[PDB]
Symmetry: C3
Subunit: 278 residues, 3 copies
Amino acid sequence: ITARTAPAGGEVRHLKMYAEKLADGQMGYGFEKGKASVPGPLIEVNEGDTLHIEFTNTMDVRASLHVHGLDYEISSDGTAMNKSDVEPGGTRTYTWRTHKPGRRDDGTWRPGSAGYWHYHDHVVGTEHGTGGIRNGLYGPVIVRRKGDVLPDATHTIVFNDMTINNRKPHTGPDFEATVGDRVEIVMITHGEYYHTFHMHGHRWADNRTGILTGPDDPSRVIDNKITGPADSFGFQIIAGEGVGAGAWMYHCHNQFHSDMGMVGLFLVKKPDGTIPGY
Amino acid sequence: ITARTAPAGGEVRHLKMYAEKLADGQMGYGFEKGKASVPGPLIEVNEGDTLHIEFTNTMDVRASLHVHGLDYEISSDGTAMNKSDVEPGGTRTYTWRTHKPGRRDDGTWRPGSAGYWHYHDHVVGTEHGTGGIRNGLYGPVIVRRKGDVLPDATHTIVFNDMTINNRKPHTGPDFEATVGDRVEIVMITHGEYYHTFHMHGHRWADNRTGILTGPDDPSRVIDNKITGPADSFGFQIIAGEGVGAGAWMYHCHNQFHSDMGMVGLFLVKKPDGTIPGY
Amino acid sequence: ITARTAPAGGEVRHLKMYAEKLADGQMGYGFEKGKASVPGPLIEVNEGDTLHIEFTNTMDVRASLHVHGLDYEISSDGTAMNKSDVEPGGTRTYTWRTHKPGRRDDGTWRPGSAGYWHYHDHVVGTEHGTGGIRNGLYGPVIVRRKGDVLPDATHTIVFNDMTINNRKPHTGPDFEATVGDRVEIVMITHGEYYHTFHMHGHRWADNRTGILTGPDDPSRVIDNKITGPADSFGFQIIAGEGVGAGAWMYHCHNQFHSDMGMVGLFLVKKPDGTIPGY
Ligand SMILES: [Cu+2]
Ligand SMILES: [Cu+2]
Ligand SMILES: [Cu+2]
Ligand SMILES: [Cu+2]
Ligand SMILES: [Cu+2]
Ligand SMILES: [Cu+2]
Ligand SMILES: [Cu+2]
Ligand SMILES: [Cu+2]
Ligand SMILES: [Cu+2]
Ligand SMILES: [Cu+2]
Ligand SMILES: [Cu+2]
Ligand SMILES: [Cu+2]
Ligand SMILES: [O-]
Ligand SMILES: [O-]
Ligand SMILES: [O-]
């Protein structure tokens, strides 16, 4: 494999994070005051790393940080039940851990933390975060196994109720690549609706990484993926492979949802910077 | 592997079962008169066993027994069409069979019966059992393969329309374990809604057993699983592994269903019997 | 394997296809004027084949051909955006390509095209084909890998909104087989609803082919599959294997949908041509 690959983990990492009310009524996470985004920033770590997140709630209401997939003690589960949220103006240090897979004392096989995960609020509006999630308090988390193939770029597409990344209908987002780039999609669903994520001109493997290990990998190959509230998956594709440059649609294939605006463009450019037909 | 494992099957087994109207209007199965439950009792067998169920309908309406996954002849399919239901006060012997996997005459591979299955009524209210299922006429079936790892306890969680196990909203059920136990969950969905099953602090393999065979198993690891009417899956987790004791929520992650009461607690205790915070 | 298997592909193939308004208001595809069907005709090819489709729109509105899974250039994506629909009475030649899996320059493994795919309209009624799809402009596409087991017959079941193959409620379709036949189902969902496809008496592997490769295939075995708009899977079963002849129901297991008509019969006959009870 002459492609870049993930190294072995085991670092202790530190991170400051804020929750911020945005001028338009939304709420968003950020690594710096004044730089919050919806989706929130991407967190990426290696199996076996530990992450300490000093989280500050700059909002006028209680807020929290709850994560999927990774190891965390009950003091870091981000629920009010377990006294794990943060009052207005407060600050709390959450700890997430990850581990490599391996053999248990009893001979069984313990799975590792690697995968396409996510984090979101758990106490704004209700004790399940219905208000925070709706306002934009969600973001992606990636845990890499040693040897995993690394991309040229990562993009995050979140189906939040009937919007993509909390955008107005029929406003994308759109992404650009050049034929040949190795592009990574992290795909997360939130809210109360069910969807199917479809991408013209490309396909991926329905397994942890989106890639086949080789001629023996039994994972099915798909271009349409059903998803419900709090599902998360990811894949990599070679932009334009076998199909060439173009304005390639991605959307929810639910005919009502795409009619209502859940559509965007994956713009794959020729080497001269152009898109066939434009 | 020094954990307990399932033995090879091939026994002929016998069982008495009743359907019973409950005093509150619900309907349930049981192995003894006066001891019906919702969910009905768990039936567990080994690939290759045969099960003869003498089923007695003690209700004032027709009722039946329909099973997923296992081999049954058309006389045991539990539909009114094939004249397989049971008149009020009547009795009928259903036969379910299971087989091991193996090579067919043509060289192809016949799959075995092992899996997490379920049984439910097919004629109460409509000819698809909409009334019986609504009332509580459903229960889990587990078929084990030789060598499967055996748990310390098994619990059944059924999303029935917008309830868990037909309970009133926000009334559990809750389960208890001690840090370290091998806990097995059978997860079944019924009715007319779609859900996603999420469990704080734990994860599992999205394959038949919920466990990885080893370093070569391509199965993805998840903590959130989409499910629709009559889907059934199962898994095992080590209670508290890598995360410790605590009151860990499980729920449907659909924000509307969560807010409406589809929540419960998986209470993992320290050895002294306590739960951090209580 | 002394069953029939797919050969290696690589042919260039040609096809004439029409879109046609039906006397009852529906629309459908066909290989011959006067012979359109809903679902449209099955297209089947071998990994590595190329397919040239001369498509003629005989209707009084724009129509197109969009396909899942296969390789196509942006000129053949069937969207109005990319100027690849067909005006009334017009003709256009779409090109679909497929490739075998294999090792990329960087050492990664490129997936092949094989699978259970489908084609449908993209511009009738809306720019996502909501009108064409609802009217009947959809059909199945099968791409075989060298070595794949071949069936005795293939049937196409499409859950389109709350109909099967656009039929009136409780009107099938029904299919007939004889105990022992190798039967292949192609299962496609369209519209705005979610379903679960269930088949009495039979089960299949939840992977690309529906079949297990042998003792090491980790794929789970199911008889109930959740599906949303534009999902497509397929499988093979041995009619009556281990369960015998009979009138076996298949349906959507959503209790509302089957009460409302989404039911058909898979009639498995004894060698004398009869069905237990009829
Ligand atoms: Cu939660
Ligand atoms: Cu959608
Ligand atoms: Cu498409
Ligand atoms: Cu969550
Ligand atoms: Cu049924
Ligand atoms: Cu739910
Ligand atoms: Cu969680
Ligand atoms: Cu059922
Ligand atoms: Cu499209
Ligand atoms: Cu349905
Ligand atoms: Cu059934
Ligand atoms: Cu499509
Ligand atoms: O599409
Ligand atoms: O959650
Ligand atoms: O059923």
